[PDB]
Enzyme design. Structure first.
Site, PDB file in Angstrom:
ATOM      1  N   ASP A 278      60.347-110.296  46.925  1.00 17.46           N
ATOM      2  CA  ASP A 278      61.414-110.836  46.103  1.00 17.46           C
ATOM      3  C   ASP A 278      62.551-111.361  46.949  1.00 17.46           C
ATOM      4  O   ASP A 278      62.927-110.767  47.957  1.00 17.46           O
ATOM      5  CB  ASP A 278      61.941-109.775  45.157  1.00 17.46           C
ATOM      6  CG  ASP A 278      62.558-110.369  43.918  1.00 17.46           C
ATOM      7  OD1 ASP A 278      63.201-111.432  44.005  1.00 17.46           O
ATOM      8  OD2 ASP A 278      62.375-109.783  42.833  1.00 17.46           O
TER       9      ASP A 278
ATOM     10  N   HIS B 255      59.682-112.934  42.196  1.00 13.08           N
ATOM     11  CA  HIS B 255      60.585-112.299  41.252  1.00 13.08           C
ATOM     12  C   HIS B 255      59.991-112.214  39.869  1.00 13.08           C
ATOM     13  O   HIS B 255      60.090-111.176  39.219  1.00 13.08           O
ATOM     14  CB  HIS B 255      61.919-113.036  41.199  1.00 13.08           C
ATOM     15  CG  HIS B 255      62.994-112.263  40.510  1.00 13.08           C
ATOM     16  ND1 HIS B 255      62.967-110.891  40.409  1.00 13.08           N
ATOM     17  CD2 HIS B 255      64.125-112.665  39.890  1.00 13.08           C
ATOM     18  CE1 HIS B 255      64.034-110.480  39.752  1.00 13.08           C
ATOM     19  NE2 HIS B 255      64.754-111.536  39.425  1.00 13.08           N
TER      20      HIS B 255
ATOM     21  N   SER C 248      64.999-107.929  34.792  1.00 16.65           N
ATOM     22  CA  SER C 248      65.931-108.035  35.929  1.00 16.65           C
ATOM     23  C   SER C 248      67.186-107.200  35.700  1.00 16.65           C
ATOM     24  O   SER C 248      67.235-106.010  36.036  1.00 16.65           O
ATOM     25  CB  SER C 248      66.270-109.494  36.204  1.00 16.65           C
ATOM     26  OG  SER C 248      67.058-109.582  37.369  1.00 16.65           O
TER      27      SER C 248
END
Lengths: 144, 846, 846, 144
Positions: free
Chosen positions: C791, C823, C713
């Site tokens: 997402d 995600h 991320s």
């Protein structure tokens, strides 16, 4: 689905960066400190006398400058560099061709040099691959 | 085999490939010209001046960028054996017709996406000959001007008069009323408006839209062409002015009808597509009907209004048919085309069936349309008030077992001789298998109906019997009707000028025939080229925009000239030239056209770009560029340099580029096109493989081990079908914008090439390439999926669902997104990236 | 330098790489265990039976797939020196806790995305001690059972009783009323409901959700934790039962309060993200607060009701504060946490401001909440009725120069001793720089307020002065607060049990200290491991789920034992074991922890996975795995096999895997975390680079010429920052889910580690990697962008805008989409594709 | 952005997957023909006795049922091949191992061959990789 082809790149944009090369490098010399402007705006030739007499009326003096080797395009962005850029004061170092009318006023690039010495080498490359599109240097023997 | 006898492509750096694409772009600024179009001849009516006509047209002069309205002056005489090049005089005085950086409305960008018109400026204009009125849509708001009506022919460029408005939003689809040139009309906010240029007076006429919320909640539109009609039936208007004026006779009031299309898009499925403003991260709703889902509920309606002498909208009136449209005309799913008879007596409309096999032309006389009110007693009142005789006449009924291609050619005549039995011309492909013109005379015998009660018409209840059906042309070639071609009917000399493929399918030639007797078909264009033509309204001279596979496109003005006693043999003599053939690139080789036969002895045509600097003996890697789908013919004897420059770039790197017109493509008749009926994918790729086998045998540089299949839209879909069903022959497959699941595609295309999901189940699972993903290769670097993210036509879902099923089957891929490009890559930066990605992918993995 | 001394990774086929991932999968299934959690001790109180307690917990037996409520029997006496492994007895009889193939509601799957609950089954349950009530949600329907309260315990499993409802939709977030266990409450359609188990009677309490239309048109929710609260402040419920029963006394009735957060999300930006049902092609609207845009308008509210001995909700009443919340409490953007003091006297709430440098805890007494009615005279009437003395007490006010981390440790003591002057415990990181517990005694000095007139609060308006703030811990370590850790305060022995990093930053140990004096900090866990612990409510025995970098996680049950006069030095003796340590697979080599010092001479920790079958002399390709962002510590002495097996797979192919926590990573205090303040993305890469050069010098198998930086991320964001600002060291960059433009990311995260775009323009331009795309490499195959299409945290727009700016700058990439994954790549097939793509990309281009 | 570790890969494959093959192989000698029912149900132990009692009071027989060595990963359908499929009737091929409660009749594959003779081969494999999950040939020796 009737042939959604790519259509290449029309780039209907040429032969005008020469006639917007001549409006570049506007210099103002009331003391020996000199300030400069740059203009790059496409698609017509009746813009030229309007912007030329505009800077005549607003006290910027002429010089003949090299046209680009290959003319540039609109809808795209170009960078301004050189020896005088960065060392001396260039606040809009990003230029861009986008059409504005013959009568109306334009985006510039303010460029102070002060006591210029004997020459200020300048550049306008493209932001695509940084090919050396445009070359110049100004001369105090052609200043007013 | 012989790895010393196969060509290895010189692997360039990425910046090198950009340098190559830029050097191609250094002269594509030359080779694209956007040759002039939409010609309107007007005579000078002088008999003592120097110029015989003025030709008005659209064009980019390359003293400017955006295309503009221009004119040429066609002289009365020319010094012969010394050719005259017409000057491009600018009609308007160099204003711009696009905002800064091309920002448009979403409806303008959607309509330009529909017609695939990539050039900027004045897109298209409307013209009225008598007043000499040029009403067009330029920049922010509508404009108009005039040149030589009751006024005179200017010599300097003039100013375009702006049309002011109190309305908000864009004013799309403007048209001049022919009966009164002061009045015009447009669509705004999906409702029909009408205005007047000199006084500024406007008037809304339809109230099917309210603008209460988004299009998920405000579902009825009027006078606008819906999605499936815009993108599959090529109709972009939903309103048609009445060309003549009737007089209501209250005191002096001149009525002016408009036929319009009411559309109830409530039941049609809604899909969300990302907006061009990626930052906002919102979507737009789109009423997009999938296969089997409900199409919009259509209806025809008359919008009348009555004006005073001074030109003020005195009265207005919505009108609707005496019975509902769906009930008066069952099995009518799409209104393909519509308009009016020239005298104004009847309003015609081409209906089309859900399966697109039952097209029928019908005439709707204006007295059939009563006023529309909620008062059911006024409604009954005017159902009695309608005369018994007036009746819809199903005049023509094309029925087929394959599919009806929409042929918009329909020229009804004045019926002043014996005032029944309408005589018309009509293109009919379903009869003989090929699109040929016919003169058809149907007898209009009304039987008399009680319009007060509601009844259900039978199968052919309004079907008039045919008096006669003379065939003006016949053969194994076809008359062009689709793709905005047209016929021109000189009723003074009784000749009909059409375009066709009578010499060969690779060329479009202007032919003329008499409709009095089906005699001799005179070609007017030179053979060895392909021509897009446009006649004068006086039928004395035409333009032809023509080209060949070798020569670039030129635009010549020919003049019909000869003894008037036999007008059919009037010789077209070259009068003047408008646009000359441009300079070809220094590193352009013209491609070679070939043909071959299948095992079924069906003739397929093909192209090839030979490798530049070919050394005989070596085998080169071959890119099979492909489209293969219906209504598109890649190979024809026309210039391939402007649209397929990348193919030449491939050749210049050393790739053999092969292009094959597989079976199912257009220009070659219904039986040829219909081999893909209910089997899309199952016959085209076999024909492509066959073409490769042929070109491999004929020319000796086709490496069968190194074959790439590249395609776009429908063509990509085939590239993926190629990699699935013919994996040993195609080394890689660059699938751009593929249609991976047919069940998601829209009605107009699919419901035609295949059937409704319940009908052709095995055809959908066999053709939906994303459901056969297990047969894609286990090897990596063999599949590159390209897709424009904001696509409205072949939505991103198709690539998304493909990638989904690749993930589920554990198969590798590569993927490239164009986040701004909708369906055609329009931005030059994105196109340059697309091509350097294509060259890199081929360089490394082919 | 030496191609005979540079290790070449074996180029496997794609199917080979799948074979490797499956061989990881087989071993991997055994390695993953989904360790027992949510422990609940209940005594047996028999003194003659065999079992001292019953431990209730969630777990999957492994016989089945979904985790379910279970229990163990903790005996009174273990046979010493022979370990007791607990039986895992089932409460429920092997029923489906989730529906077929994991289908949930969209809000349930979203809540499991915010909590990151990858496991299926009974994810969370609620428990009431005295009644012995187990209220849980199974297969989108509430269930309950009872085990050993006024009833007795069991040895067979029972049927879980379903709760019948008339409500249509899911019943989320159930909680038993602690004051009355016959009553419970839940969220339905974003409105608070309350029910009663045995009689089945349900009752709505809030009316903020009209249910009329889309969420763009129905914006008020109640009892629902919004997006930014759910995903950045780790609060998932927005309503809190009052734990005691008050008696207003009409004649016999009993009030039961609930504090809830009403949220009016109308003025917050809506973004559309594609739905899981790709066939429908529709999106879901999401009220997503972009950085700089305005947060939801929040407020606290009491939904009370009154009941009787027969068990019916007789009366009900909404209440709201005497002034509007935003005006009574200026500079309050987010309600971080809330609840009640255990006696019921006050409802507490942690407020927090938009800069996130100003947090303050406040107590709100229930008399401050007047009834809510639209009648402004009833409103003034009860504004007169509220007493002058009663007052909200801003008890605690943390102010900082870096940012406030939300510390959910807040233990208000009973204050009946010395009947004023609330004494509580509170974690405070901003004071000393490290999260340390304090005992704080404030003085509730009410000055007297007229609540009818509206006043403007001052800057320290309700702020009570502190009587004393004794510091119970101090050092260069922190007390763990966030991520669902907690303290346990035995008020009888007067001890506070906390978790901390006192021994070392790499390990979480259970410590105990007295809150009378900071005598000494007694560790209750073995060193060399990291522990997640959970106490009995009787404070006599705990569970610890612990692990190390080498050993897998075990779950041991310890028992505090010693002389009762000295409770601080009670020795934790191992009583029994619940889930003993699993088998490390034979190919799994546990990784090596290291540390080093920077040029600023700060100590950074790091991990390394050595290449399996290491050959001395050989230099190896190095994958710098990275997260490098706040609130996450990658490097700690804990088992890295169940979550970072991919790193071992890389090692098993021969890649050196390096993992560094540079400055910003948590559990090392605020000054450490704060090196990224307003330059996040900029300093981490220098720490990662320095970590490479140290590991290169220390171990001799790090090839600097072949370095890959992989992240997901914030790690993917850093991998792209690595390839931009350190191009010569990092060869490739596998950037998954990257945050490419900070201005697009949500408020809670960005507004805290940088700030509002008007404040930090240079930091946003230097940190948004998509605006720095020109410095990416011109070379191809050095950048692989991975992104889940659906997402909701790091929206697809980020990857889309990156690809957009890559297109505009003319730079190559590669891209992989996961069309069905939000995600984290959730589905194992999609995760397997992700891993084989990662191995392939490294194999070919690194 | 709280670090989805994203290791995932939670197949959670059960050791019941060998005895899901034991549910497999139900045949019925009521007529001259013989036919088969195929079941693969993990995630409940009671499905064994449930489908056992259900299909013997529905008059079917239990056969040998060789177990797969690999406890099969959940979430993936498994295809059916062999000498049986393609010559004699099998109504569905692929089996998705999905849970239902033991009180319900599950999805089953129905397999008609008529007369039996020397036997005929049935195979269960994966579509993900085409590795052997299960393989046997039917008996003429485990019948009445």
């Amino acid at each position: 689905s009737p042939l959604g082809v790519l259509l290449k790149m029309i780039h209907n944009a040429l032969r005008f960066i020469p006639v917007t090369s001549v409006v570049l490098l506007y210099h103002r010399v009331h003391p020996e400190e000199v300030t400069f402007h740059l203009y790059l705006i496409p698609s017509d030739c009746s813009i030229r006398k309007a912007i030329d007499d505009l800077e005549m009326k607003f006290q910027f003096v002429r010089i003949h400058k090299p046209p680009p080797l290959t003319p540039l395009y609109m809808g795209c962005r170009y960078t301004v560099s050189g020896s005088g850029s960065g060392m001396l004061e260039i606040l809009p170092k990003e230029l861009e061709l986008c059409y504005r009318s013959p009568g109306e006023d334009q985006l510039f690039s303010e460029f102070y040099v002060g006591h210029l010495g004997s020459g200020i080498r300048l550049q306008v490359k493209d932001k695509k691959d940084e090919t050396l599109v445009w070359e110049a240097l100004v001369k105090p023997g052609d200043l007013m | 085999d012989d790895p010393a006898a196969r060509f290895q492509v010189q692997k360039h750096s990425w910046d090198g490939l950009r340098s190559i694409i830029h050097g191609s772009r250094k002269y594509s600024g030359l080779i694209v010209n956007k040759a002039p179009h939409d010609f309107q001849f007007v005579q000078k009516t002088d008999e003592s001046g120097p110029h015989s006509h003025r030709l008005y047209y659209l064009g980019m002069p390359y003293g400017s960028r955006e295309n503009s309205l221009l004119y040429s002056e066609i002289p009365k005489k020319v010094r012969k054996e010394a050719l005259l090049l017409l000057s491009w005089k600018q009609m308007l005085d160099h204003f711009q017709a696009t905002p800064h950086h091309g920002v448009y409305s979403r409806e303008e960008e959607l309509l330009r996406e529909r017609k695939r018109l990539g050039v900027f400026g004045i897109t298209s204009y409307d013209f009225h000959s008598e007043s000499g009125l040029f009403l067009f849509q330029a920049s922010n708001s509508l404009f108009h001007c005039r040149d030589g009506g009751k006024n005179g022919f200017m010599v300097s460029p003039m100013k375009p008069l702006e049309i002011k408005t109190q309305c908000s939003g864009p004013r799309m689809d403007p048209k001049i009323c022919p009966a009164d040139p002061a009045f015009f009309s447009f669509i705004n906010n999906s409702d029909l408006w009408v205005a007047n240029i000199e006084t500024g007076e406007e008037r809304r006429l339809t109230f099917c839209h309210q603008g209460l919320s988004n299009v998920l909640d405000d579902p009825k539109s009027a006078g606008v062409a819906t999605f499936v009609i815009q993108e599959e039936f090529d109709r972009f208007t939903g309103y048609w002015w009445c060309p003549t004026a009737s007089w209501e006779g209250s005191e002096g009031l001149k009525t002016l009808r408009i036929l319009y299309e009411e559309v109830d898009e409530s039941e049609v499925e809604v899909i969300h597509v990302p907006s061009p403003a990626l930052e906002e991260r919102k979507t737009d709703s789109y009423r997009y009907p999938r296969t089997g889902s409900k199409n919009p509920k259509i209806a025809l309606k008359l919008a009348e209004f009555q004006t005073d002498s001074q030109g003020k909208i005195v009265s207005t009136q919505e009108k609707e048919l005496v019975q509902p449209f769906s009930s008066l005309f069952p099995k009518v799913e799409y209104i393909a085309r519509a308009g009016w008879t020239r005298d104004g007596k009847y309003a015609w409309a081409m209906f089309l069936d859900r399966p697109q096999q039952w097209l029928q032309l019908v005439l709707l006389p204006p007295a059939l349309f009563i006023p529309s009110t909620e008062n059911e007693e006024q409604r009954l009142a005017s159902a009695r008030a309608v005369p018994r005789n007036v009746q819809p006449y199903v005049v023509y009924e094309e029925v087929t077992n394959v599919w009806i291609n929409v042929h918009d050619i329909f020229y009804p005549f004045p019926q002043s001789e014996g005032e029944d039995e309408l005589c018309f011309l009509r293109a009919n492909e379903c009869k003989t298998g090929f699109c040929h013109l016919y003169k058809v005379t149907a007898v209009l015998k009304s039987q008399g109906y009680d319009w007060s009660e509601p009844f259900s018409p039978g199968e052919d209840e309004f079907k008039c019997p045919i008096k006669e059906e003379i065939a003006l042309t016949s053969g194994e070639w076809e008359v062009l009707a689709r793709h905005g071609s047209k016929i021109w009917v000189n009723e003074e000399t009784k000749l009909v000028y059409f375009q066709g493929t009578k010499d060969t399918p690779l060329e479009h030639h202007l032919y003329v025939v008499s409709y009095e007797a089906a005699g001799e078909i005179v070609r007017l264009t030179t053979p060895g080229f392909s021509h897009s033509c446009s006649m004068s309204q006086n039928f004395d001279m035409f333009v032809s925009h023509y080209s060949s596979v070798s020569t670039p496109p030129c635009v010549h003005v020919y003049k019909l000239s000869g003894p008037d006693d036999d007008p059919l043999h009037k010789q077209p003599r070259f009068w003047a030239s408008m646009m000359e053939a441009a300079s070809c690139p220094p590193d352009y080789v013209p491609p070679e056209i070939f043909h071959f036969h299948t095992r079924s002895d069906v003739r397929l045509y093909g192209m090839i770009y030979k490798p530049h600097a070919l050394q005989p003996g070596k085998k080169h890697p071959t890119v099979l560029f492909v489209y293969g789908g219906p209504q598109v013919q890649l190979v024809n004897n026309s210039f391939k340099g402007i649209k397929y420059l990348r193919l030449n770039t491939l050749a210049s790197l050393g790739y053999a580029v092969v292009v094959i017109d597989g079976r199912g493509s257009c220009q070659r008749g219904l039986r040829f096109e219909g081999a893909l009926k209910n089997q899309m994918g199952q016959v085209e790729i076999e024909d492509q493989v066959e073409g490769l086998q042929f070109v491999a045998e004929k020319y000796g540089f086709i490496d069968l081990s190194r074959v790439a299949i590249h395609g776009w839209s429908y063509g990509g879909f085939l590239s993926l079908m190629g990699l699935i069903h013919k994996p040993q022959v195609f080394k890689v497959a660059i699938a751009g914008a593929p249609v991976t699941v047919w069940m998601a595609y829209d009605t107009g295309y699919t419901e035609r090439y295949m059937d409704v999901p319940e009908n052709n189940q095995h055809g959908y699972e066999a053709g939906s390439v994303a459901l056969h993903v297990e047969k894609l290769p286990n090897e990596p670097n063999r599949l590159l999926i390209l897709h424009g993210f904001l696509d409205e036509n072949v939505h991103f879902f198709h690539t998304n669902f493909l990638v989904s099923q690749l993930i589920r089957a554990g198969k590798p891929y590569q993927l490239q997104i164009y986040p701004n490009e909708r369906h055609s890559i329009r931005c030059p930066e994105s196109g340059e990236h697309y091509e350097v990605t294509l060259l890199h992918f081929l360089q490394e993995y082919l």
